[PDB]
Amino acid sequence: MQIFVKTLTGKTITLEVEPSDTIENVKAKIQDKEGIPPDQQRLIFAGRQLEDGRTLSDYNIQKESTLHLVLRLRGG
């Protein structure tokens, strides 16, 4: 399914993943195409924070969903 990963910067990227995929893997895919380190990746959905070792189905994330990528500033 195609999901919309929108960062606080404004840019919205399209990610082709399946519900059975883990956020930890999702981050890696974003790191591959965008180059954003998973360590500083924090996804926000439904007004709550998402985890890493969980699947998209864990938060009931469907297709065409605009996820929010909040940069987790580490060291500054």
């Binding site: 959905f45 439904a46 007004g47 709550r48 924070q49 605009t66 987790r72 500033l73």
Partner: protein
């Protein structure tokens, strides 16, 4: 059943899930199972370079039967030192917040959260000493 209230809340649910608007705000059904849409949860991502930097604040919103004609009930769950916010209950004051004092039926929960975050960037709040991160007004 309030047709406009239910219809409006169902629409705002989408905007909350997708986090449409400013971008640094999100909300949605807290219980989720409760389809009465009277128990909403709000999340405000604290703006960097302020006293709310990297602080994920959680709020509780209750839209009454008069919604959206009348202002809903908004209160903070996480301890926050901001003008208009009670230090014991975390309840937000209406006459303190512009959008709550001068509420309009054209407003939404989205605008409320955005306004609150906007006021957090204000000089009168950005330099307010915040208590230990993690403390909640309940539990």
């Amino acid at each position: 059943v309030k047709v406009p209230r239910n219809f409006r809340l169902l629409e705002e649910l989408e905007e909350g899930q997708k986090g449409v608007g400013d971008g640094t705000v999100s909300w949605g059904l807290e219980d989720d199972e409760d389809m009465t849409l009277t128990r909403w949860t709000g999340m405000i991502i604290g703006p960097p370079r302020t006293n709310y930097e990297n602080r994920i604040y959680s709020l509780k919103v209750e839209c009454g039967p008069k919604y959206p004609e009348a202002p809903p009930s908004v209160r903070f769950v996480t301890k926050i030192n901001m003008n208009g916010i009670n230090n014991s209950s975390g309840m937000v004051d209406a006459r303190s917040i512009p959008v709550l004092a001068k509420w309009q039926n054209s407003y939404s929960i989205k605008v409320v959260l955005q306004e609150l975050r906007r006021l957090m960037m204000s000089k009168e709040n950005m330099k307010l000493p915040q208590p230990p991160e993690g403390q909640t007004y309940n539990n």
